[PDB]
């Protein structure tokens with residue numbers, strides 16, 4: 206198996222389907238990558254899972270993870286793992302941070318503990334986590350952002366991407382066995398996105414992420430930015446849209462050339478009473494489901510829908526049994542994998558344009 | 574070590590403090606018993622944890638738990654474990670049940686699976702789970718309830734309690750090593766509570782639970798029922814108030830003779846942005862905490878408060894980091910154990926009446 210080899214098997218318009226080959230296995234694209242957890246079927250399973258680096262840094266700690274054999278041991282998962290850099294928390298926790306060109310220092314804890322992130326430390330932490338795909342250390346620019354703020358943020362992130370590249374290359378075990386992605390920034394501004402894409406391609410990366418979206422901008426604006434930003438990235442390398450998104454977000458992003466996705470929505474929705482189906486999202490707490498004998502989705506092949514009716518899950522949640530939210534979450538994660546499979550099939554068949562139209566017609570009709 | 578020996582070391586008014594000795598260890602009373610989970614600060618630790626039998630019946634299943642060594646192996650917990658009977662879910666999931674004198678059958682699942690609970694099956698399941706304290710199979714009577722509904726429900730549960738006793742006694746390994754509690758019902762009605770207490774004492778149990786409360790009645794009504802119901806139970810045996818409660822609920826229930834407690838609130842509050850402190854509950858999402866450098870509670874000895882400021886937890890939750898809710902929950906669980914220790918200390922000193930008054934004055938002033 207090669208270190209990192211992206212092959213495109215078929216194309217339709219801007220959409221692609223293919224595979225990323227790595228030493229720990231193959232990732233079918235377009236891919237959805239769910240967040241991995243500590244260790245406690247196939248049609249609903251992922252090819253790669255994610256480590257939330259900031260969380261792991263604080264609990265139980267990167268060195269403790271490394272001593273127990275890295276995230277593959279911790280998560281009981283021998284296939285590829287992608288770790289984030291911390292660049293999202295640089296934004297989302299900004300009021301607890303002090304930023305400089307060197308990096309981001311977080312406020313001291315009450316026990317004197319203090320955490321810092323930089324291009325060098327983020328790569329080191331991702332190495333200690335045993336990550337197969339390493340993200341450059343960036344700043345997810347806040348939204349909305351003035352052109353001035355967006356530009357200074359993006360320029361600093363491009364300097365951090367060069368430092369991330371060099372740090373990664375300085376560790377022979379990491380450079381020989383893992384891969385490194387650069388992250389495009391530039392907010393919603395075309396010229397800044399172009400400058401960011403130019404800077405990343407000069408450095409050179411194994412894959413390219415579209416950063417700074419899924420920060421509250423809304424689908425129309427997100428699609429608009431993807432319309433001009435994705436063609437700026439190298440065509441023959443993977444494109445990873447960070448944080449996106451709803452099922453219809455994912456379909457339209459694939460239509461605009463995205464190959465990889467992650468999103469908090471399957472788990473956040475599942476714990477808040479929302480399930481994704483081919484007929485759109487459903488709020489299982491609605492009284493219409495109190496005697497609905499059907500599974501959450503009548504096509505879904507996941508383990509939950511083989512066993513559990515809408516009525517059961519509705520009453521579990523109403524009765525305060527946490528099993529209700531677990532089932533919603535497990536179904537949502539599995540539904541996302543079936544969506545990606547239908548997307549990949551349709552591109553391979555040369556019918557992706559028709560799939561996207563049929564998908565949207567049924568998803569938005571809400572005849573659940 | 575004895576199978577089950579309850580000793581009262583000190584008394585003040587109706588309040589008691591003492592110990593329950595069992596083969597797997599000692600339970601200090603009044604006790605708070607948190608819900609146990611699958612295995613992944615002694616002053617904040619419990620003496621016993623709980624198995625949610627209905628959940629475990631469905632996942633992963635009672636037989637699967639038993640084959641892997643029971644709940645002590647499943648939860649990585651060698652100390653005592655109490656399991657519920659299913660009688661709460663007989664109520665909270667009633668619309669998915671068919672009830673008869675024999676027991677309670679739940680609606681068939683989409684895979685043909687079907688679960689039933691009865692005095693015999695509940696005791697059998699609790700045996701397979703490896704429970705040290707077994708609850709009789711009851712019905713948590715719905716609230717509110719007519720006197721007629723309350724009476725038929727309680728009379729049926731008293732027949733089920735006799736069957737539970739016989740089933741428990743029919744398994745020599747369970748009868749020699751575990752203990753069995755009867756559950757008082759009768760809703761808010763004094764005469765029915767008396768009939769229930771009488772019926773249970775005739776059968777004879779190791780401990781006695783006050784069932785049918787913490788179902789929405791409100792503290793004034795809950796205290797009123799405890800006022801006459803707890804003195805109906807045998808004085809020299811433990812009294813377990815199921816589902817209670819808020820910190821001030823627990824103090825007042827101890828004042829009325831309760832020895833054991835369980836409550837969903839520490840975890841439900843911690844997942845919904847509410848933390849318990851000596852100055853009352855706080856909603857950590859309030860903007861006052863955005864730059865509050867203090868821990869959740871200034872006295873608390875838990876692991877969270879040694880490390881984490883209100884500001885950090887406030888921003889973690891706002892940023893959607895799941896770690897925020899984990900820290901809130903862990904602090905709430907630990908705070909409950911410190912409350913019980915202070916309660917036990919104060920009774921031992923003969924200063925519980927003054928503790929309760931000081932507790933309430935400070936907790937309700939809300940000067941956090």
Ligand SMILES: Nc1nc2c(CCc3ccccc3)c3nc[nH]c3cc2c(=O)[nH]1
Nearest residue numbers: 255289292293345416417418419447448
């Ligand atoms: N580094 C970085 N991460 C982002 C994430 C987190 C994705 C992630 C990866 C791996 C694990 C968890 C989360 C975003 N989530 C929503 N919008 C996002 C934007 C960015 C961004 O611009 N930079």
Ligand SMILES: Nc1nc2c(CCc3ccccc3)c3nc[nH]c3cc2c(=O)[nH]1
Nearest residue numbers: 623657660661713784785786787815816
């Ligand atoms: N069997 C039974 N359980 C109750 C519980 C669950 C306690 C429990 C024990 C062990 C684990 C979890 C829950 C109640 N919770 C709130 N009110 C309650 C009343 C009853 C009741 O009347 N009967």
Ligand SMILES: [Zn+2]
Nearest residue numbers: 505507510536
């Ligand atoms: Zn499903």
Ligand SMILES: [Zn+2]
Nearest residue numbers: 873875878904
């Ligand atoms: Zn604390």
